[PDB]
Design a protein around this ligand. Structure first.
Ligand code: NAG
Lengths: 49, 49
């Protein structure tokens, strides 16, 4: 389970088109001209209520 | 009919590093008007030198 919100004063939320992502780095082997351990991840999308 | 199914696949999803050598390619041509599922694990000889 994972969740993301957005407030500022007196907890008044704001509506927006969120674009969250969740990735991992297997072994921080320092790029080798092919991303710094940018290993597979499912990104997501949606609107805030 | 009078042909096949053709396809191009992006190899960057595989990230061919950290010990990667062989890879199998299974199939499943399910013939219509026949409950016949004849597979064929062809070209399990595709390589990365
Ligand atoms: C994760 O969501 C499910 C939804 O049914 C819930 O039962 C479960 O308790 C949630 N996890 C926590 C730590 O509350």
């Amino acid at each position: 389970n994972v969740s993301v919100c957005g407030l500022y004063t007196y907890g008044k939320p704001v509506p927006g088109h969120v674009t969250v992502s969740i990735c991992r780095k297997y072994s921080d082997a320092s790029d080798c001209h092919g991303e710094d351990s940018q290993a597979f991840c499912e990104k997501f999308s949606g609107q805030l209520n | 009919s009078h042909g096949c199914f053709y396809q191009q696949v992006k190899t960057k999803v595989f990230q061919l590093k950290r010990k990667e050598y062989e890879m199998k390619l299974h199939t499943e041509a399910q013939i219509q008007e026949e409950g016949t599922v004849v597979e064929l694990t062809g070209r399990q000889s595709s390589e990365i030198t």
